[PDB]
Amino acid sequence: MKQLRFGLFENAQTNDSGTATWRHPDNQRHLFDTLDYWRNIAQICEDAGLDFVFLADAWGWADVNGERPDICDVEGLDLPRLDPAIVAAALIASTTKLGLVMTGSTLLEQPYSFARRMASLDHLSKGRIGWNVVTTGTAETASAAFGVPMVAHDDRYDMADDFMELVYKLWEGAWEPDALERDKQGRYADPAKVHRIDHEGPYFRSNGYGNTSYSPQGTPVLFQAGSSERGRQFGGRHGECIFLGGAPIPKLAEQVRAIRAEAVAEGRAADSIKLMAAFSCVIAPTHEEAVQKYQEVLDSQTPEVAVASYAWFTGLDLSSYDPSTPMSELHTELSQTQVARFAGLTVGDVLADWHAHGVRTKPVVGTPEEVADAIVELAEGADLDGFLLTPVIQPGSTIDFIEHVLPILRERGVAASGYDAPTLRERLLGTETPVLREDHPGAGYRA
Amino acid sequence: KQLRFGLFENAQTNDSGTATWRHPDNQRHLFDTLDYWRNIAQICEDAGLDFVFLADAWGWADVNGERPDICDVEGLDLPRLDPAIVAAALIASTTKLGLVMTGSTLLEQPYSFARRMASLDHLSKGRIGWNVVTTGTAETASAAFGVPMVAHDDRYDMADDFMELVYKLWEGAWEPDALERDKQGRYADPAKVHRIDHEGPYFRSNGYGNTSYSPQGTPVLFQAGSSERGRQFGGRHGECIFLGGAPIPKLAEQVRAIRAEAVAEGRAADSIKLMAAFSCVIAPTHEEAVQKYQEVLDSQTPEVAVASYAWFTGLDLSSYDPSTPMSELHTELSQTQVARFAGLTVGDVLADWHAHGVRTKPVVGTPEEVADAIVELAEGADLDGFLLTPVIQPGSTIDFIEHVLPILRERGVAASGYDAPTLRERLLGTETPVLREDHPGAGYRAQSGA
Ligand SMILES: Cc1cc2nc3c(=O)[nH]c(=O)nc-3n(C[C@H](O)[C@H](O)[C@H](O)COP(=O)(O)O)c2cc1C
Ligand SMILES: Cc1cc2nc3c(=O)[nH]c(=O)nc-3n(C[C@H](O)[C@H](O)[C@H](O)COP(=O)(O)O)c2cc1C
């Protein structure tokens, strides 16, 4: 049996994904800016043996023509947030084995300082760091915030390739793994193992030494989730663990086959890339109890939010249209035969499903046995290597999965019983060594 | 007058042109382990020190245009860790200790720097400080980032623009009570959340800030520029100014000039705090302290001094007989350097450099002698505290805490412990955690004036 890995999707802000369940009485996400919130989440995850916590990030915000509507602040749709690298570092200090994965942007980070920061996390954590490589999902606002011009979608990925090449040189080529000797009767470092790098790319330039010596993993575990044609090529080249949003099993299976074919086209083994699907659930001892439990979180969300956030995430201002109007009865846009995928849905239908989960994956709602069976049928049907648990409320959604579903998966032998490897790469990739595989591009920048 | 005490640290093994890492009691070769930092922070927090300060650098040694092998054999310059990451890890290990980190206005981007510092301030409940630098490793650091070099005085003009932008983000973007998080009312009050607009010579920003108003608003601002332009910048923005060691009459003049600069910027002379770097070597008798210091100096490889002197000054003295008067090298010296070296030989210069690099010269003696030196400095130069710069770690810090700090507390010149939750309250001696109204950053508050 393939043993699935599990990570927890989190972000350093109250609400996410176009939903706003922060008003639910048991939701603690409004305390995201306190260290106690994060210490508790991490302890829950580490005591359960979850492989990692993943901190999503964004730099921009939801806006309509340069302005956030009141609702953004009355319901905390987007802002405020914290920086994930700072949260990750704080969590290092209260964990020993839990993996820590953070989003970091190739569009807005400077590679030289970013490489030093990530390698610092990797040193202090003893090799537990991952990096979710993003360009931007909020390109308009994030660019204005940093004072830089727009970069079009595919050019963002060419910039990301150049970024990756430089950070690979800094992580893998600047200091050999054994450069540091720290012998008070010998050498501090072997001068033959410390190298100047030289990089002249279309977007970035660097000439000189790297600040950080070779870290326990070398390069953080690389996560990536792009679904465009160009983003799929980028993930096929660099990504070690690829995230997928929820989809019906047959569609997910085809996407998995496509992503593994992109890795093969870049010279990598098909099984050397790990696929993890977002997965949400609401668990209760009976099916009806779960439905009511899910219902109570849905009822906690203000009804005006659904229309507001659907607008931003898609562009369709639906406040006007009566809920009985078929979607296909509207224009706005979409490329004909795509409009047929709507298959005669009504505005009410879309907003009700959007109210339910936004861009988060549709939760599996049922008993522990029902949720466990869903996980297994997803993993087997789509050839997945793990799941990214996306909570509907914190910490309850995580606690429920840990206390009721994970033990079933463990008894069935589909989930490991605990931490068997000390670095994140060894744990997620099954590698023997904590460092990149030889068929990964970053390995080609080693001395 | 209650003196404040901070610990000067950096996230690398050696610093300041010296290299005492081979001393049997030095543990700084473990700088890249969390356990080293956990231990330092506990030692400091248990003693009630006001803060730990993390220096930083981005560049490396450049001796005759190359990086010679001795830089790696002795770990003179590299490797290092990022101080924001060390600081964040130390947040989670401490509850009251202040954490001050260096951050460069030349190389950081202000929008993400503002968010990073405000995140540290939120998570720490207001215990963060920022030592504002314009990089000192400018040449090599610029090449690493791929950017053109910027002149000394231009760096301070860029720094003024950087400060204006981060003040808008920290003080002007979210009012202090914008967040209500009332599950029956509003998450945030939309009238208290503001777009910023900034169009400066070096930086541009248009939009909202990522982080809401943090417990101190703006981190406590530390600064250490000693040039004329750097003193002007400190007098405008710095809340705590760090001075290197010097004889009492010289420190007193520097303190006087910095306070006059603050007054000219519209601030109260006493609202800026002056802290001197202070090093010491402590033993139970004077003679034992002298010998202890000799054993520190003997731990440094003899070949280091001439190589690190060349790194810091550009002057390679390795080919000269040590009896050579510096005056004979005038073709390689500016007029100011010739005057400063007058009477000195190459051997004098390298002997002095071997003993302490650019670190302050230690007071060497008994605990009573060191305590007396601290009081004399503070009274004679009008200082508000001291930045303890260790010669070896953790020994230098432990010696001071165990033997000198109790004397200072008995004499009533150092506080018993922590009776202020934020770093600004503790260091400025105020009940208010946010910038004073006569500070430039306060003018960006939307609260009555935007
Ligand atoms: C599970 C998951 C997590 C994601 N997290 C982030 C994130 O933290 N920041 C971000 O900008 N985008 C995030 N995304 C969006 C993707 O990075 C990506 O941009 C999107 O799938 C569209 O693909 P494309 O970039 O190739 O157009 C996430 C996507 C998924 C499926
Ligand atoms: C106690 C002390 C600590 C310093 N720490 C740093 C540091 O961490 N990083 C840095 O680039 N410069 C550091 N400096 C150098 C000063 O910031 C400054 O550049 C130097 O004093 C020269 O002054 P000027 O910039 O006005 O010419 C420090 C100086 C002192 C006295």
XYZ file of N, CA and C in Angstrom, chain B residues 223-427:
615
model
N 20.147 53.550 15.631
C 20.975 54.012 14.525
C 22.386 54.280 15.045
N 23.375 54.077 14.179
C 24.769 54.260 14.581
C 25.668 55.011 13.592
N 25.146 55.676 12.585
C 26.010 56.565 11.781
C 26.872 57.653 12.436
N 28.191 57.677 12.153
C 29.111 58.611 12.781
C 29.572 59.724 11.852
N 29.256 59.652 10.561
C 29.547 60.765 9.672
C 28.603 61.934 9.943
N 28.897 63.056 9.311
C 28.051 64.234 9.471
C 26.642 63.944 8.968
N 26.542 63.327 7.800
C 25.232 63.013 7.260
C 24.552 61.934 8.094
N 25.335 60.959 8.565
C 24.798 59.908 9.411
C 24.321 60.417 10.755
N 25.040 61.380 11.351
C 24.550 62.005 12.583
C 23.265 62.797 12.347
N 23.138 63.471 11.194
C 21.899 64.148 10.845
C 20.735 63.163 10.707
N 20.991 62.035 10.067
C 19.946 61.030 9.937
C 19.532 60.483 11.305
N 20.507 60.119 12.139
C 20.191 59.668 13.490
C 19.426 60.692 14.299
N 19.831 61.963 14.217
C 19.128 62.979 14.975
C 17.701 63.179 14.529
N 17.420 62.927 13.249
C 16.059 63.016 12.748
C 15.198 61.815 13.141
N 15.721 60.588 12.986
C 14.889 59.374 13.072
C 15.212 58.475 14.251
N 16.453 58.467 14.719
C 16.846 57.506 15.727
C 16.224 57.824 17.073
N 15.749 56.776 17.744
C 15.336 56.859 19.139
C 16.423 56.429 20.103
N 17.266 55.499 19.678
C 18.449 55.095 20.429
C 19.646 55.127 19.489
N 20.656 55.917 19.816
C 21.865 56.028 19.000
C 22.983 55.258 19.688
N 23.643 54.380 18.937
C 24.762 53.551 19.408
C 26.047 54.286 19.060
N 26.961 54.387 20.015
C 28.290 54.933 19.803
C 29.335 53.860 20.055
N 30.384 53.867 19.252
C 31.515 53.013 19.545
C 32.310 53.528 20.737
N 33.128 52.652 21.297
C 33.910 53.041 22.452
C 34.883 54.152 22.125
N 35.179 54.946 23.141
C 36.072 56.083 23.015
C 36.301 56.637 24.398
N 37.354 57.430 24.580
C 37.563 58.064 25.879
C 36.410 58.988 26.224
N 36.137 59.073 27.522
C 35.022 59.829 28.090
C 34.888 61.215 27.463
N 35.929 62.041 27.395
C 35.721 63.379 26.818
C 35.290 63.345 25.367
N 35.711 62.323 24.614
C 35.280 62.206 23.226
C 33.825 61.755 23.129
N 33.415 60.800 23.960
C 32.024 60.402 23.979
C 31.136 61.562 24.405
N 31.587 62.356 25.365
C 30.734 63.440 25.826
C 30.451 64.424 24.695
N 31.464 64.724 23.877
C 31.258 65.639 22.761
C 30.309 65.033 21.732
N 30.456 63.749 21.446
C 29.555 63.111 20.485
C 28.124 63.128 20.989
N 27.930 62.787 22.266
C 26.597 62.841 22.861
C 26.014 64.249 22.755
N 26.793 65.262 23.137
C 26.327 66.653 23.042
C 25.894 66.994 21.618
N 26.691 66.600 20.625
C 26.376 66.950 19.240
C 25.112 66.252 18.758
N 24.915 64.989 19.153
C 23.716 64.247 18.768
C 22.478 64.841 19.409
N 22.546 65.197 20.695
C 21.409 65.843 21.335
C 21.093 67.199 20.699
N 22.119 67.988 20.316
C 21.857 69.268 19.661
C 21.215 69.066 18.300
N 21.601 67.991 17.609
C 21.009 67.662 16.328
C 19.536 67.321 16.491
N 19.213 66.553 17.533
C 17.817 66.223 17.806
C 16.998 67.482 18.074
N 17.533 68.410 18.876
C 16.826 69.659 19.178
C 16.558 70.428 17.893
N 17.536 70.448 16.979
C 17.376 71.166 15.718
C 16.302 70.531 14.830
N 16.068 69.230 14.984
C 14.988 68.517 14.315
C 13.660 68.643 15.045
N 13.588 69.454 16.085
C 12.340 69.643 16.788
C 12.043 68.613 17.851
N 13.018 67.816 18.247
C 12.826 66.819 19.285
C 13.461 67.297 20.596
N 12.992 66.739 21.701
C 13.581 67.047 22.996
C 14.972 66.430 23.097
N 15.939 67.201 23.624
C 17.313 66.690 23.755
C 17.363 65.373 24.521
N 16.491 65.205 25.507
C 16.532 64.030 26.358
C 15.663 62.898 25.847
N 14.909 63.103 24.760
C 14.036 62.060 24.211
C 14.778 61.090 23.304
N 16.019 61.387 22.967
C 16.878 60.452 22.249
C 17.796 59.814 23.286
N 17.993 58.503 23.189
C 18.820 57.767 24.137
C 20.142 57.427 23.473
N 21.222 57.560 24.220
C 22.572 57.326 23.725
C 23.118 56.105 24.438
N 23.548 55.112 23.684
C 24.136 53.912 24.274
C 25.528 53.705 23.717
N 26.480 53.473 24.608
C 27.841 53.176 24.193
C 28.078 51.667 24.132
N 28.809 51.256 23.108
C 29.357 49.905 23.083
C 30.390 49.764 24.191
N 30.332 48.629 24.886
C 31.153 48.375 26.056
C 31.577 46.923 26.044
N 32.876 46.716 26.151
C 33.454 45.391 26.249
C 34.213 45.267 27.545
N 34.252 44.056 28.095
C 35.032 43.903 29.307
C 35.545 42.480 29.413
N 36.580 42.338 30.229
C 37.180 41.072 30.632
C 37.294 41.110 32.145
N 36.602 40.186 32.798
C 36.368 40.225 34.238
C 37.012 39.009 34.876
N 37.691 39.223 35.996
C 38.225 38.136 36.805
C 38.246 38.611 38.246
N 38.475 37.705 39.206
C 38.409 38.130 40.617
C 39.517 39.082 41.048
N 40.710 39.003 40.463
C 41.748 39.990 40.724
C 42.143 40.668 39.418
N 42.716 41.865 39.553
C 43.097 42.612 38.368
C 44.087 41.817 37.536
N 45.075 41.221 38.204
C 46.139 40.474 37.542
C 45.588 39.275 36.790
N 44.611 38.574 37.373
C 43.969 37.472 36.662
C 43.190 37.964 35.443
N 42.564 39.145 35.513
C 41.866 39.652 34.347
C 42.830 39.976 33.211
N 43.972 40.588 33.532
C 45.010 40.870 32.539
C 45.441 39.600 31.814
N 45.680 38.539 32.573
C 46.076 37.254 32.007
C 44.952 36.615 31.188
N 43.725 36.654 31.688
C 42.585 36.220 30.889
C 42.534 36.917 29.531
N 42.776 38.225 29.498
C 42.726 38.930 28.229
C 43.867 38.491 27.316
N 45.046 38.254 27.888
C 46.160 37.739 27.102
C 45.803 36.402 26.469
N 45.115 35.541 27.212
C 44.733 34.245 26.635
C 43.690 34.389 25.523
N 42.806 35.380 25.586
C 41.919 35.639 24.446
C 42.732 36.047 23.213
N 43.611 37.033 23.374
C 44.408 37.509 22.243
C 45.299 36.415 21.666
N 45.878 35.573 22.521
C 46.694 34.466 22.020
C 45.893 33.412 21.271
N 44.552 33.407 21.349
C 43.806 32.369 20.652
C 43.643 32.696 19.177
N 43.877 33.944 18.804
C 43.718 34.391 17.430
C 44.999 34.109 16.655
N 44.852 33.442 15.523
C 45.958 33.175 14.620
C 46.723 34.464 14.268
N 48.064 34.463 14.336
C 48.815 35.724 14.117
C 48.623 36.329 12.731
N 48.381 35.504 11.720
C 48.212 35.977 10.351
C 46.877 36.676 10.094
N 45.932 36.650 11.036
C 44.623 37.252 10.776
C 44.712 38.776 10.685
N 45.407 39.415 11.635
C 45.339 40.865 11.744
C 45.693 41.543 10.423
N 46.798 41.145 9.800
C 47.206 41.887 8.614
C 46.223 41.672 7.472
N 45.604 40.472 7.386
C 44.595 40.203 6.360
C 43.293 40.962 6.622
N 42.779 40.965 7.869
C 41.526 41.696 8.101
C 41.740 43.212 8.108
N 42.939 43.685 8.467
C 43.209 45.119 8.342
C 43.078 45.564 6.886
N 43.561 44.727 5.966
C 43.461 45.024 4.537
C 42.011 45.005 4.068
N 41.213 44.082 4.596
C 39.794 44.045 4.285
C 39.104 45.339 4.729
N 39.328 45.767 5.965
C 38.599 46.910 6.510
C 39.108 48.251 5.995
N 40.391 48.365 5.675
C 40.958 49.656 5.293
C 41.416 49.721 3.846
N 41.568 48.593 3.177
C 42.255 48.564 1.893
C 43.779 48.615 1.947
N 44.382 48.819 3.119
C 45.833 48.914 3.259
C 46.420 47.543 3.569
N 47.318 47.084 2.710
C 48.056 45.831 2.883
C 49.426 46.161 3.468
N 49.602 45.866 4.754
C 50.823 46.161 5.473
C 51.740 44.946 5.582
N 51.433 43.864 4.869
C 52.124 42.593 5.093
C 53.581 42.626 4.658
N 53.958 43.508 3.745
C 55.328 43.485 3.255
C 56.284 44.347 4.074
N 55.818 45.037 5.114
C 56.636 46.036 5.794
C 57.209 45.511 7.102
N 58.468 45.831 7.341
C 59.024 45.642 8.668
C 58.155 46.373 9.691
N 57.810 45.742 10.815
C 56.921 46.411 11.788
C 57.473 47.717 12.367
N 58.772 47.945 12.325
C 59.276 49.224 12.804
C 59.042 50.354 11.800
N 58.452 50.071 10.647
C 58.231 51.094 9.616
C 57.261 52.164 10.102
N 57.657 53.432 10.160
C 56.688 54.489 10.474
C 55.596 54.558 9.425
N 54.356 54.717 9.885
C 53.266 54.877 8.929
C 53.487 56.101 8.041
N 54.156 57.139 8.554
C 54.396 58.341 7.752
C 55.115 58.025 6.444
N 55.878 56.929 6.403
C 56.608 56.536 5.202
C 55.710 55.923 4.140
N 54.463 55.597 4.475
C 53.527 55.033 3.517
C 52.541 56.077 3.008
N 52.919 57.354 3.059
C 51.951 58.412 2.811
C 51.355 58.326 1.409
N 52.091 57.788 0.433
C 51.509 57.738 -0.903
C 50.290 56.837 -0.953
N 50.124 55.944 0.029
C 48.966 55.061 0.097
C 47.932 55.541 1.116
N 48.078 56.766 1.606
C 47.233 57.293 2.672
C 46.682 58.651 2.275
N 45.445 58.908 2.688
C 44.879 60.244 2.629
C 45.536 61.111 3.685
N 45.387 62.425 3.514
C 45.939 63.379 4.468
C 45.439 63.104 5.879
N 44.130 62.855 6.022
C 43.534 62.547 7.321
C 44.163 61.311 7.961
N 44.402 60.264 7.168
C 45.026 59.059 7.699
C 46.456 59.314 8.138
N 47.232 60.075 7.361
C 48.598 60.378 7.783
C 48.580 61.084 9.134
N 47.679 62.067 9.292
C 47.596 62.798 10.557
C 47.185 61.874 11.698
N 46.232 60.987 11.449
C 45.778 60.070 12.495
C 46.851 59.063 12.887
N 47.699 58.652 11.952
C 48.761 57.704 12.259
C 50.017 58.335 12.850
N 50.089 59.658 13.016
C 51.384 60.289 13.273
C 52.110 59.639 14.449
N 53.382 59.331 14.245
C 54.205 58.706 15.246
C 54.086 57.199 15.285
N 53.028 56.655 14.727
C 52.788 55.210 14.801
C 53.538 54.478 13.716
N 53.917 53.247 14.038
C 54.520 52.320 13.098
C 53.505 51.282 12.623
N 53.899 50.582 11.572
C 53.112 49.453 11.095
C 52.840 48.471 12.226
N 53.862 48.187 13.040
C 53.695 47.260 14.149
C 52.720 47.733 15.218
N 52.757 49.022 15.581
C 51.709 49.601 16.435
C 50.317 49.355 15.851
N 50.153 49.694 14.584
C 48.842 49.592 13.958
C 48.344 48.150 13.993
N 49.197 47.199 13.623
C 48.730 45.810 13.588
C 48.565 45.216 14.980
N 49.379 45.637 15.942
C 49.193 45.184 17.322
C 47.849 45.644 17.878
N 47.503 46.912 17.654
C 46.213 47.418 18.076
C 45.074 46.691 17.369
N 45.218 46.461 16.067
C 44.182 45.782 15.301
C 43.999 44.345 15.772
N 45.100 43.660 16.067
C 45.029 42.300 16.588
C 44.232 42.247 17.886
N 44.373 43.262 18.739
C 43.744 43.185 20.051
C 42.223 43.352 19.977
N 41.687 44.123 19.019
C 40.245 44.373 19.061
C 39.567 44.740 17.737
N 40.301 44.769 16.627
C 39.673 45.118 15.354
C 38.933 46.443 15.480
N 37.679 46.503 15.011
C 36.856 47.705 15.214
C 35.987 47.588 16.459
N 36.165 46.534 17.239
C 35.407 46.423 18.475
C 35.964 47.424 19.484
N 35.110 47.856 20.408
C 35.549 48.734 21.483
C 36.622 48.035 22.308
N 37.575 48.786 22.798
C 38.613 48.202 23.652
C 37.996 47.819 24.984
N 38.296 46.634 25.513
C 37.706 46.207 26.781
C 38.295 46.922 27.984
N 37.425 47.155 28.960
C 37.834 47.390 30.342
C 38.183 46.042 30.957
N 39.408 45.928 31.456
C 39.963 44.669 31.976
C 40.220 44.847 33.462
N 39.553 44.048 34.292
C 39.807 44.112 35.719
C 38.797 43.305 36.514
N 38.634 43.722 37.748
C 37.733 43.079 38.677
C 36.311 43.563 38.429
N 35.322 42.854 38.959
C 33.935 43.319 38.805
C 33.749 44.733 39.318
N 34.377 45.064 40.449
C 34.243 46.417 40.985
C 34.837 47.431 40.027
N 36.001 47.125 39.454
C 36.602 48.046 38.483
C 35.740 48.207 37.245
N 35.122 47.131 36.771
C 34.304 47.269 35.583
C 33.047 48.062 35.912
N 32.461 47.806 37.086
C 31.267 48.541 37.477
C 31.585 50.014 37.619
N 32.753 50.340 38.188
C 33.136 51.747 38.310
C 33.316 52.395 36.942
N 33.946 51.684 36.000
C 34.104 52.212 34.646
C 32.764 52.510 33.987
N 31.768 51.638 34.178
C 30.446 51.873 33.610
C 29.844 53.153 34.172
N 29.878 53.313 35.493
C 29.291 54.496 36.116
C 30.026 55.754 35.656
N 31.360 55.688 35.581
C 32.134 56.863 35.185
C 31.795 57.273 33.762
N 31.724 56.297 32.855
C 31.331 56.585 31.481
C 29.955 57.219 31.412
N 28.987 56.659 32.139
C 27.615 57.127 32.010
C 27.477 58.541 32.544
N 28.171 58.852 33.637
C 28.068 60.185 34.211
C 28.875 61.193 33.395
N 30.065 60.784 32.944
C 30.965 61.696 32.258
C 30.549 62.007 30.835
N 29.852 61.088 30.166
C 29.419 61.323 28.793
C 27.907 61.519 28.654
N 27.139 61.435 29.743
C 25.690 61.635 29.689
C 25.019 60.525 28.892
N 25.421 59.287 29.145
C 24.900 58.155 28.402
C 23.662 57.596 29.098
N 22.827 56.907 28.324
C 21.601 56.319 28.853
C 21.687 54.808 28.951
N 22.718 54.205 28.383
C 22.908 52.776 28.539
C 24.134 52.289 27.798
N 24.265 50.962 27.742
C 25.447 50.340 27.199
C 25.053 49.116 26.396
N 25.753 48.950 25.287
C 25.632 47.781 24.424
C 26.816 46.857 24.724
N 26.565 45.762 25.447
C 27.654 44.860 25.839
C 28.144 44.086 24.621
N 29.398 44.275 24.270
C 29.986 43.569 23.144
C 30.937 42.506 23.674
N 30.596 41.232 23.542
C 31.405 40.168 24.144
C 32.676 39.900 23.370
N 33.708 39.486 24.096
C 34.929 39.066 23.421
C 34.875 37.588 23.096
N 34.294 36.780 24.000
C 33.925 35.395 23.705
C 32.533 35.142 24.266
N 31.798 34.238 23.624
C 30.447 33.888 24.054
C 30.350 32.402 24.445
N 29.491 32.087 25.424
C 28.627 33.011 26.180
C 29.375 33.626 27.387
N 30.636 33.227 27.545
C 31.421 33.616 28.723
C 31.411 35.098 29.051
N 31.651 35.956 28.049
C 31.722 37.396 28.307
C 30.406 37.922 28.869
N 29.286 37.424 28.341
C 27.961 37.840 28.800
C 27.668 37.297 30.184
N 28.009 36.034 30.422
C 27.748 35.439 31.726
C 28.569 36.136 32.800
N 29.821 36.456 32.493
C 30.646 37.125 33.493
C 30.022 38.442 33.913
N 29.582 39.228 32.935
C 28.994 40.531 33.221
C 27.733 40.375 34.060
N 26.849 39.458 33.650
C 25.589 39.221 34.362
C 25.839 38.763 35.787
N 26.782 37.851 35.976
C 26.937 37.255 37.296
C 27.680 38.163 38.263
N 28.565 39.025 37.769
C 29.492 39.710 38.665
C 29.368 41.223 38.656
N 29.104 41.823 37.504
C 29.021 43.267 37.403
C 27.595 43.741 37.567
N 26.659 43.091 36.902
C 25.279 43.561 36.955
C 24.743 43.593 38.377
N 25.092 42.665 39.278
C 24.601 42.789 40.650
C 25.121 44.017 41.368
N 26.366 44.439 41.101
C 26.901 45.648 41.726
C 26.110 46.862 41.261
N 25.922 46.972 39.946
C 25.167 48.070 39.352
C 23.754 48.144 39.915
N 23.121 46.988 40.142
C 21.800 46.976 40.751
C 21.858 47.419 42.209
N 22.887 46.988 42.952
C 23.035 47.417 44.345
C 23.196 48.926 44.440
N 23.944 49.516 43.516
C 24.128 50.960 43.507
C 22.923 51.706 42.953
N 21.915 50.992 42.452
C 20.712 51.638 41.980
C 20.834 52.314 40.638
N 21.822 51.937 39.824
C 21.983 52.510 38.495
C 21.482 51.577 37.407
N 21.046 50.387 37.766
C 20.433 49.471 36.832
C 19.179 48.925 37.489
N 18.130 48.782 36.686
C 16.827 48.347 37.164
C 16.885 46.897 37.619
N 16.014 46.554 38.567
C 16.000 45.196 39.104
C 15.599 44.174 38.043
N 14.685 44.541 37.143
C 14.167 43.602 36.161
C 13.291 44.243 35.097
N 12.206 43.554 34.698
C 11.323 43.980 33.605
C 10.042 44.578 34.175
N 9.954 45.904 34.242
C 8.667 46.510 34.574
C 8.186 47.424 33.455
N 8.092 46.871 32.257
C 7.497 47.510 31.093
C 7.376 46.443 30.015
N 6.199 46.248 29.421
C 6.043 45.153 28.455
C 6.648 45.395 27.086
N 6.636 46.626 26.557
C 7.190 46.857 25.229
C 8.617 47.378 25.341
N 9.359 47.229 24.247
C 10.738 47.695 24.209
C 10.793 49.209 24.268
N 9.876 49.884 23.573
C 9.900 51.350 23.596
C 9.656 51.887 25.005
N 8.676 51.338 25.714
C 8.429 51.791 27.080
C 9.658 51.579 27.949
N 10.275 50.406 27.826
C 11.434 50.077 28.646
C 12.597 50.991 28.316
N 12.863 51.188 27.039
C 14.063 51.948 26.719
C 13.860 53.441 26.879
